[PDB]
Design a binder for this molecule. Structure first.
Ligand SMILES: CCCCCCCCCCCCCCCCCC(=O)OC[C@H](CO[C@@H]1O[C@H](CO[C@H]2O[C@H](CO)[C@H](O)[C@H](O)[C@H]2O)[C@H](O)[C@H](O)[C@H]1O)OC(=O)CCCCCCCCCCCCCCCCC
Ligand code: CLA
Ligand code: CLA
Ligand code: CLA
Ligand code: CLA
Ligand code: CLA
Ligand code: CLA
Ligand code: CLA
Ligand SMILES: CCCCCCCCCCCCCCCC(=O)OC[C@H](COP(=O)(O)OC[C@@H](O)CO)OC(=O)CCCCCCCCCCCCCCC
Ligand SMILES: CC1=C(C/C=C(\C)CCC[C@H](C)CCC[C@H](C)CCCC(C)C)C(=O)c2ccccc2C1=O
Ligand code: SF4
Ligand code: SF4
Lengths: 157, 88, 743, 80, 42, 154, 143
């Protein structure tokens, strides 16, 4: 008995199957992250990714920024997080402009790990990525606003 | 088989390892909320102009209207000027 | 199957005929030189035995005799050391006032004014102060008169003769057989019990009979000439009983198991003896006894000829799990066939052991009056650190050599190694990411602190006074060490070392010996820098080892050899793809790591430990505790460490330390000299030598041995050799001048 | 792709073809030299530019010449 | 014997003997005539 | 004197360097006993220092404002012992070395393996050629006039 | 006249557990290569990408990412073992292109059906100076 097996039974594809790669917990959890929901409108997946990251980014900027000890304005350091979301929404935007063209189809795989044919994820399409950037921006600024909305009764505010 | 000149996506491993392909877990109403309020942001060209100009004007506002209580560069020197090694 | 002595008679005749034939060992080199490159190859392949022949037996016999020659040279070196201690030294004067006399064992001749280097070292002696620490060793062993050092030098000369003769004997006369070398079980048994066990027992026997009594008399202030000779403690046991009473019994508690009586001279008190500053000699003798027993037992694990015992093959094969397949099966055949594999393992372990020695000897001074000879301690630490680093780089080199030359899955397979090769990509990518993360999260903090201190924002730095990054784990560990005596160590009277236990500051002769070492944000940053540099060195060396055979760029790299320049300008460029060049770069990075390590050591000891103690207990360190605030900044390391402590070496002219002032600049010179080789390539130099050869041939004075610029590999070898020599010698001169002046 | 050329100084020892790691060189019949054969480079699209062929040419000066030209995926030695 | 003399004629050994004799000579010259920035005998 | 320099016998800084150097050695001497070996060593260094300074001042060495002997290599006949005379001595020795080595390379260039006698020295041939450099300016000059020193058309 | 063997899929592949040096997205969208050989028995052979594999008895098919990996493995198949080998190129469309041995004869052995490509009929030092090809798309060696 052995634990490490070739990637999907093919030894000549550059990868391996390990508990980190191929495991029911890892496979399910990654299959349930919004970036891997290959049948959902990319606008909504962008909303979730934007909400999670915009919410997370507020913490470090507020607690480590220059105005951190000047409590008069340190709570407004979420603006820096919001500015990074703006910058990242530009990085996301300019990425799709160069990667996918208007009439180009999806570059995502049109297969399944079991061989059956599949409908490619619309995220690797020009309009799909545009919806994801718009969703990430909307959820991003919403995540920063909602994170700054909370401030009190926390051990590290 | 693993080598099939017909389908090279299966031959070269062009698979979706962690794609779910399941229907949406996001219920309705909520999705329509985001699909109508995040609608104008999904034009990548318009979003690019909106981000650059909007972000640049936001940066210009908070920089032009800065405060001496927040930035030492605007507060300026509060002490009398020093004296150079020989000159002023 | 039966371990026994096996040799051949007269395999190689003793004659000078092959002396007169340069390059006799190689078949291409023996034809003589057509160009000058020959001259270099003769020295590069001088010790590459497994490339001179393919017979493992010849190789093993050559290696055996080379070991004997090395032992002869080491014994000659020790003979020189003891003889200089006897003939040109002030050891008898240092023995009466060890706290004021400077140890010296070299006196220069007066020819061109170099007699200025014969500086006033005390005891009416003009010489060169030594930092090797032989005085402390000779005092700990109990040596008093120059006659005993003379006799030790003569014995070392005789032993050098014996080793040289044995080297000649086991190659030209009775030369052992392959199976004899391959009796690994017997060899490990004799090295654990016979070599290490009986050696520790012999040294414990000396320490309980000579070191302890003579050192008691030295501590009491008795004049060394008025001290009884060591053998007088072996005849009249009244002398031994007047110092250690248990010797009045006569090995009776040892046989009756009343060992509790021997606690007089076999103790577990720990810490330091406050009179000498070294570990309690009774504790060291008890230690050597315990080590002797442990090794004498461990030398019985492996079976030989009497059934009982282990076979390493079975132990290896039995260790295989679900992640590693049939792991360890095949390793016994690998490690009994390849010399380079054994050399890699042993170089790695011996280098890491040397580093461990460097730490343990500073934190637990073993010899009397060693802790206060700051020059000797700093020099010992730095020297052992460099030895260990070089040996580990050599481990990497020989692992790669084994990969290229002795690895073959069709004959001697191993599952663990094959599995490692099947994901070298993942291993190297993850180590690469770890190195990037550590580089940002250690040195980037230094850049942050520099930029905050320059912008007039000392509260936005990472400091003990601002954003603190306390090494809580190491602090808690040293605290747990401090509280161990009497709790998780009831037999221990004091702490394991003084750097643990709070309080208990030991000082000798007005200078401090040891005290609790603080650990703050500076220590945290420096430890992370050390981890990062070690990781990058490991990345370079291991990536060279794993990709020695094949890669996506060159799938047949093993055919090109272990040491080859490149494989052409194609594929974008293939320079420095050989494993040899990976060792070549790992040399630079090992230097870059060890240098930061030793600078950390120097500044920490001069800031928070070493110094002068008052009569009332006021300790002022060599630098005024400036480590916490200055070392958290690159500009602080430039100013408060280099610029400040290089004063002694740039001011040593006109004194006995002027030789260090000369070596400082000479090492700067050779370091910059290496940059000509490291930044250039041999094509330009060959094109220059072309015009030079024209000039020579114009005047009928061109040599037959056509001049040729150095090879690419030789260019890199010369470059890294000179770079390392220059850097290490610069730091050597700087350290020695600084610590001998301010010590 | 890199350009490779064969000059008529070639003696026909077939050494450039043996050293080539991507099968770019060939040995064609010829009437100029004693071995009745000369080299040719019909598959420079696979040429990587290692100049392992030039390292093996005994002619003075070389009879194989590799002029490094426009880089491609094949000439850069990329497996990705 | 002839092979031993041929070894003594090799480049490093001949260089050491030659440079040792040269080093000793210059040392004795600077021992009987130390310092000397000039040619004083005119 | 020349270039504004003053002879070292006249310079006060030159004599002050000799004083301070000797007094510095004497300061090291007081630490040791009069019969000691370091004492005789320091006394010998003091006598060697006096001899050095006296010799420099006696042979007409010029001193600067720093009290250190400056050398004049313009060719002024008052100071030929500072460069031109030792330089002619060097050129005699250098030509000797080059001429003997050249004679050796010419003698072995017709050997079966000329490289053999370049990595294993033919000491008998060398010992017979080392004394031809004694007359190297003559043997070289004649080879210059007879066309034997330079290889034709190279 | 020579006829290249067509690539037969479903041909056995050597026994191998898998390594990280295998195919990547280049094989999916750009190209990849396939080497085939016969072999007499089951043996162990070092892989040009990773560790060791078990060469199956009878026809063997092995897909690699680069052409140089194929020729390197083939050369070792011809040296250590005594095995003939061919290899092809495979585009993402499914098309196959025969590569080596082109003529069915090894390239180091002269074959009469071969034509000259890039063969200059002069000494290498008889090329022209670069000024004589300036402002033209020529090189002194293309001629
Ligand atoms: C005091 C005030 C007055 C002074 C007057 C001047 C006096 C000068 C006296 C010089 C000779 C005195 C000592 C002679 C001892 C015999 C040495 C000898 O066998 O001297 C003769 C030898 C050999 O003589 C010639 O040497 C030549 C050099 O070629 C040889 O060079 C080598 C010779 O060893 C090798 O044999 C080599 O194969 C070969 O090439 C040729 O062999 C000639 O055929 C041969 O006749 O030379 C040599 O060693 C030359 C050695 C002497 C050089 C003297 C230099 C003085 C400065
Ligand atoms: C401190 C560093 C250093 C040093 C010392 C040199 C020195 C030299 N370079 Mg160099 N260079 C350097 C850095 C350095 N370079 C760097 C970083 C680069 C960029 C890659 C270059 C690129 C470069 C080029 C392109 C060229 C040189 C050339 C030269 C030589 C010029 C000739 C000369 O001046 O006579 C000698 C000067 C010396 C300093 C020699 C000092 C050493 C003496 C001989 C020591 C005596 C030996 C003594 C007995 C010690 C015993 C050693 C024992 C172990 C045996 C010279 C030896 C040119 C050349 O080749 O000249 C023809 C040449 O074209 N250099
Ligand atoms: C109790 C037995 C014994 C002892 C004391 C030693 C000791 C030593 N062995 Mg050894 N060995 C032994 C048994 C022993 N061996 C057996 C049974 C085998 C397998 C057959 C080997 C095979 C072996 C190999 C292959 C090598 C060694 C080497 C060494 C040296 C390692 C370097 C060192 O530690 O420096 C420390 C120096 C000392 C401790 C000085 C003491 C040396 C004494 C005088 C030697 C006495 C031990 C000797 C075996 C007795 C026989 C000699 C007698 C006939 C005259 C060392 C001196 C290495 C070597 O050759 O080094 C030259 C090495 O390559 N051993
Ligand atoms: C290889 C190590 C070694 C050696 C060579 C010796 C040798 C010796 N020991 Mg010793 N001993 C040793 C280790 C050693 N010991 C250790 C580790 C301990 C601590 C347990 C002792 C504790 C010890 C005691 C208490 C005594 C000796 C004594 C002696 C001497 C008596 C021998 C005799 O005449 O019979 C002898 C020279 C006896 C003695 O002093 O005789 C004069 C004696 O009283 N030994
Ligand atoms: C017990 C330790 C040990 C042993 C037995 C060996 C043995 C061997 N090594 Mg190795 N190595 C070691 C440690 C060791 N190494 C360490 C610690 C390193 C890290 C630096 C290396 C890195 C290394 C490399 C990169 C290579 C080897 C190679 C070799 C093989 C050929 C050695 C040779 O002939 O070189 C000849 C020795 C010389 C030409 C002398 C060179 C002069 C040195 C480098 C500078 C001298 C400076 C000196 C210390 C101080 C200055 C004095 C000066 C001013 C006079 C040989 C079997 C070579 C090989 O081909 O592998 C098969 C190879 O390329 N080793
Ligand atoms: C001072 C010169 C220098 C510097 C800065 C580096 C830096 C580095 N080396 Mg290198 N190296 C050097 C000299 C240097 N080396 C020399 C002379 C040699 C020849 C022996 C080598 C040989 C060598 C090898 C063989 C390897 C490296 C590797 C690395 C990288 C390790 C990963 C890391 O630490 O990430 C962190 C990055 C840094 C520490 C650089 C400073 C980053 C600052 C603090 C952050 C500033 C960011 C800022 C926002 C920039 C934006 C400004 C914008 C306006 C432009 C690293 C970037 C290893 C590697 O590839 O990585 C795994 C590796 O394999 N080096
Ligand atoms: C994990 C931390 C740790 C460490 C590193 C040590 C280390 C040590 N302890 Mg200790 N001890 C600990 C925790 C620890 N202890 C704790 C939590 C307790 C209970 C409070 C004790 C109680 C204790 C007592 C009573 C004694 C020691 C002693 C010792 C020393 C002799 C070792 C020994 O007894 O042989 C091994 C003993 C065994 C039973 C074999 C255990 C097998 C291990 C795993 C191997 C040794 C240096 C002895 C001493 O004082 O030495 C001077 C002693 O008498 N310890
Ligand atoms: C090209 C560079 C150079 C030059 C021109 C000099 C020149 C000189 N050096 Mg010096 N030196 C140098 C480099 C140089 N050195 C270097 C790099 C070092 C470091 C290793 C030294 C270290 C050094 C020391 C330690 C000393 C000198 C001394 C001297 C002087 C002694 C002259 C002498 O030996 O008496 C005369 C010698 C001869 C006439 C011998 C020639 C006769 C031949 C052998 C036979 C004649 C046959 C007819 C001299 C002016 C000495 C001094 O005292 O300075 C005043 C002295 O002590 N040097
Ligand atoms: C040692 C710590 C590593 C623990 C490995 C955990 C461990 O020992 O697991 C043990 C695991 C199982 O081994 P087996 O059951 O096959 O053992 C049977 C035989 O091989 C041994 O006789 O080995 C592996 O997981 C393969 C290596 C992959 C793991 C690589 C991760 C590398 C990251 C390590 C660095 C982070 C920690 C640094 C420490 C300072
Ligand atoms: C300078 C340099 C050289 C030239 C270096 C050379 C030629 C070293 C050899 C010089 C020594 C001094 C020649 C040996 C002289 C003999 C010992 C004979 C001398 C006679 C007596 C004085 C002993 C390279 O060959 C080279 C190659 C690759 C990368 C960089 C470089 C590089 O930088
Ligand atoms: S450079 Fe290399 S790949 Fe190109 S033709 Fe020459 S040998 Fe073949
Ligand atoms: S290596 Fe040179 S001489 Fe030999 S066949 Fe090729 S082109 Fe001709």
């Amino acid at each position: 008995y052995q634990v490490v097996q070739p990637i999907n039974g093919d030894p000549f594809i550059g990868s391996l199957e390990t508990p980190v790669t191929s495991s029911p917990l890892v496979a399910w959890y990654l299959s349930n992250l919004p970036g891997y929901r290959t049948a959902v409108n990319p606008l909504l997946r962008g909303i979730e990714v934007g909400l999670a990251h915009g919410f997370l980014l507020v913490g470090p900027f507020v607690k480590a920024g220059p105005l951190r000890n000047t409590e008069i304005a340190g709570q407004a350091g979420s603006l820096a997080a919001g500015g990074l979301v703006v910058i990242l929404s530009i990085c996301l935007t300019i990425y799709g402009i160069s990667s996918f063209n208007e009439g180009d189809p999806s570059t995502a795989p049109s297969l399944t790990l079991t061989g059956r044919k599949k409908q490619p994820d619309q995220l690797q399409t020009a309009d799909g990525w545009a919806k994801f950037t718009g969703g990430f921006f909307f959820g991003g600024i919403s995540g920063v606003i909602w994170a700054f909305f909370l401030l009190y009764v926390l051990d590290l505010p | 088989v693993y080598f099939d000149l017909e389908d090279l996506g299966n031959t070269t491993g062009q698979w979706d390892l962690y794609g779910s392909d399941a229907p949406s877990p996001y219920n309705s109403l909520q999705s329509k909320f985001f699909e109508t309020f995040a609608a104008p942001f999904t034009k990548r060209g318009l979003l690019l102009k909106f981000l650059i100009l909007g972000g640049g004007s936001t940066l210009a506002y908070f920089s032009a209207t800065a405060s001496g209580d927040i930035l030492p560069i605007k507060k300026g020197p509060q002490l009398p000027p020093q004296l150079g090694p020989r000159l002023g | 199957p039966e371990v026994k002595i096996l040799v051949d008679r007269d395999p190689i005749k003793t004659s000078f005929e092959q002396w007169a034939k340069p390059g006799h060992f190689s078949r291409t080199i023996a034809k003589g030189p057509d160009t000058t490159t020959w001259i270099w190859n003769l020295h590069a392949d001088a010790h590459d035995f497994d490339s001179h022949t393919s017979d493992l037996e010849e190789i093993s016999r050559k290696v055996f005799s080379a070991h004997f020659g090395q032992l002869s040279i080491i014994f000659l070196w020790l003979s020189g050391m003891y003889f200089h201690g006897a003939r040109f030294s002030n050891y008898e004067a240092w023995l009466n006032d060890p706290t004021h006399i400077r140890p010296s064992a070299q006196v220069v001749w007066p020819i061109v004014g170099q007699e200025i280097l014969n500086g006033d070292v005390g005891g009416g002696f003009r010489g060169i102060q030594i930092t090797s620490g032989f005085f402390q060793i000779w005092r700990a062993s109990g040596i008093t008169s120059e006659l005993q050092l003379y006799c030790t030098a003569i014995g070392a000369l005789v032993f050098a003769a014996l080793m040289l003769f044995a080297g000649w004997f086991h190659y030209h006369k009775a030369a052992p057989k392959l199976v004899w070398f391959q009796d690994v079980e017997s060899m490990l048994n004799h090295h654990l019990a016979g070599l290490l066990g009986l050696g520790s027992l012999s040294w414990a026997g000396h320490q309980v009979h000579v070191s302890l009594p003579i050192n008691q008399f030295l501590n009491a202030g008795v004049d060394p000439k008025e001290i009884p000779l060591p053998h007088e403690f072996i005849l009249n046991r009244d002398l031994l009983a007047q110092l250690y009473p248990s010797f009045a019994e006569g090995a009776t508690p040892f046989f009756t198991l009343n060992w509790s009586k021997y606690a007089d001279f076999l103790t577990f008190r720990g810490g330091l003896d406050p009179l000498t500053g070294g570990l309690w000699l009774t504790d060291i003798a008890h230690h050597h006894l315990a080590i002797a027993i442990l090794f004498l037992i461990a030398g019985h694990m492996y079976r030989t000829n009497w059934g009982i015992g282990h076979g390493i093959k079975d132990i290896l094969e039995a260790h295989k799990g679900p992640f590693t397949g049939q792991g360890h099966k095949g390793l016994y055949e690998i490690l009994t066939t390849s010399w380079h594999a054994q050399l890699s393992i042993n170089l790695a372990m011996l280098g890491s052991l040397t580093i461990i020695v460097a730490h343990h000897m500073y934190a637990m001074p073993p010899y009397p009056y060693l802790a206060t000879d700051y020059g000797t301690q700093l020099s010992l630490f730095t020297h052992h650190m460099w030895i260990g680093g070089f040996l580990i780089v050599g481990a990497a080199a020989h692992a790669a050599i084994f990969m290229v030359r002795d690895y073959d899955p069709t004959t001697r397979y191993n599952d663990l190694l094959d599995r490692v090769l099947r994901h070298r990509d993942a291993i190297i990518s993850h180590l690469n990411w770890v190195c990037i993360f550590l580089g940002f999260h250690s040195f980037g903090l230094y850049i942050h602190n520099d930029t905050m201190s320059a912008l007039g924002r000392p509260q936005d730095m990472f400091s003990d006074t601002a954003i603190q990054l306390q090494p809580v784990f190491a602090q808690w560990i040293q605290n747990t060490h401090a509280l161990a005596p009497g709790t998780t160590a009831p037999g221990a009277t004091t702490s394991t070392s003084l750097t643990w236990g709070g309080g208990d500051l030991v000082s000798v002769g007005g200078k401090v010996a040891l005290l609790p070492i603080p650990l703050g944000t500076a220590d945290f940053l420096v430890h992370h820098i050390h981890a990062f540099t070690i990781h990058v060195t490991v990345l370079i060396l291991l990536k060279g080892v794993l990709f020695a055979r094949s890669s996506r760029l060159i799938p047949d790299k093993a055919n090109l050899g272990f040491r080859f320049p490149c494989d052409g300008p194609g594929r974008g460029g293939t320079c420095q793809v050989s494993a040899w060049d990976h060792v070549f770069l790992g040399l630079f990075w090992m230097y870059n790591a060890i240098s930061v390590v030793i600078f950390h050591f120097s500044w920490k000891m001069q800031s928070d430990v070493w110094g002068s103690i008052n009569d009332q207990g006021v300790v002022t360190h060599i630098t005024g505790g400036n480590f916490a605030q200055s070392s958290i900044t690159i500009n602080g390391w430039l100013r408060d460490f280099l610029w400040a402590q290089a004063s002694q070496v740039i001011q040593s002219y006109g004194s006995s330390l002027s030789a260090y002032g000369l070596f400082f600049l000479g090492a700067h010179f050779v370091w910059a000299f290496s940059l000509m080789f490291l930044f250039s390539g041999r094509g330009y130099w060959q094109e220059l030598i072309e015009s030079i050869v024209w000039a020579h041939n114009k005047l009928k004075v061109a040599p037959a041995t056509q001049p040729r610029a150095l090879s690419i590999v030789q260019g890199r070898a010369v470059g890294v050799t000179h770079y390392l020599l220059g850097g290490i010698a610069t730091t050597w001169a700087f350290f020695l001048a600084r610590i001998i002046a301010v010590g | 792709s890199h350009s490779v050329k064969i000059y008529d100084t070639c003696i026909g020892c077939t050494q450039c073809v043996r050293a080539c790691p991507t099968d770019v060189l060939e040995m064609i019949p010829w009437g100029g030299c004693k071995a009745k054969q000369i080299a040719s480079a019909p598959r420079t699209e696979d040429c990587v530019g290692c100049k392992r062929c030039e390292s093996a040419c005994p002619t003075d000066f070389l009879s194989v010449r590799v002029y490094l030209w426009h880089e491609t995926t094949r000439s850069m030695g990329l497996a990705y | 014997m002839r092979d031993l003399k041929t070894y003594l004629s090799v480049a490093p050994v001949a260089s050491t003997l030659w440079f040792a004799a040269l080093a000793g000579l210059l040392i004795e010259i600077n021992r009987f005539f130390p310092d000397a920035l000039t040619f004083p005998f005119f | 004197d020349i270039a504004g320099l003053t002879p070292c016998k006249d310079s006060k800084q030159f004599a002050k360097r000799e004083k301070q150097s000797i007094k510095k050695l004497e300061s090291s001497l007081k630490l040791y006993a009069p019969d000691s070996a370091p004492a005789l060593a320091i006394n010998a260094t003091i006598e060697k220092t006096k001899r050095r300074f006296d010799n420099y001042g006696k042979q007409g060495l010029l001193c600067g404002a720093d009290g250190l002997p400056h050398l004049i290599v313009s060719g002024d006949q008052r100071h030929w012992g500072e460069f031109i005379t030792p330089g002619i001595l060097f050129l005699y020795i250098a030509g000797w070395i080059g001429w003997v080595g050249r004679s050796y390379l010419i003698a072995i260039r017709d050997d079966k393996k000329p490289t053999q006698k370049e990595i294993i020295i033919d000491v008998p041939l060398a010992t017979g050629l080392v004394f031809r450099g004694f007359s190297w300016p003559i043997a070289a000059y004649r080879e210059l006039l007879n066309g034997e020193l330079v290889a034709k058309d190279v | 006249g020579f006829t290249p063997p067509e690539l037969d899929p479903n041909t056995p592949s050597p026994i191998f557990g898998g390594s990280t040096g295998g195919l990547l997205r280049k094989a999916q969208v750009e190209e990849f290569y396939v080497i085939t050989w016969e072999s007499p028995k089951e043996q162990i052979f070092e892989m040009p990408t990773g560790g060791a594999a078990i060469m199956r008895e009878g026809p063997n098919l092995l897909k690699l990412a680069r052409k140089e990996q194929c020729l390197a493995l083939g050369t070792r198949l011809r040296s250590k073992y005594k095995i003939k080998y061919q290899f092809y190129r495979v585009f993402p469309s499914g098309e196959v292109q025969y590569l080596h041995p082109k003529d069915g004869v090894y390239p180091e052995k002269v074959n009469p059906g071969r034509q000259g490509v890039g063969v200059n009929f002069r000494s290498i030092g008889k090329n022209v100076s670069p000024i004589e090809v300036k402002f033209t798309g020529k090189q002194p060696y293309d001629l």
